[PDB]
Design a protein around this ligand. Structure first.
Ligand SMILES: [Ca+2]
Length: 112
């Protein structure tokens, strides 16, 4: 049962490192960790420059560092097509993780 905690998650600075802690994942599955936002209804765009892949361990956990930015160039789809700029002080952004099947979780973050 996926659950995630992002610390810290509010009053963040541009270029700040946060820790993403997840539990209840499937051991051995690769999860994509990243900062994302809804760019268009039904379309999520994320920062491909700061995203990373981590395999969940035998306990179904992942603990990863992620650098977040108050504005980023979002990529959409599986081929990573550039969409454009996302400003997280105007739209809601999140940090979280998900597998290729969409299993995962995310937490909304805010910048100072
Ligand atoms: Ca459009």
């Amino acid at each position: 049962a996926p659950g995630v905690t992002v610390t810290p998650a509010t009053g963040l600075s541009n270029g700040q490192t946060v820790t993403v802690s997840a539990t209840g994942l499937t051991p051995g599955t690769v999860y994509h960790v990243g900062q994302c936002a809804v760019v268009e209804p039904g379309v999520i765009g994320c920062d491909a420059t700061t995203s990373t892949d981590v395999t969940a361990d035998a306990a179904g956990k992942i603990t990863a560092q992620l650098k977040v930015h108050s504005s980023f160039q979002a990529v959409v789809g599986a081929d990573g097509t550039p969409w454009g700029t996302v400003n997280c002080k105007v739209v809601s952004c999140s940090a979280g993780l998900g597998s290729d099947s969409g299993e995962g979780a995310a937490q909304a973050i805010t910048f100072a």
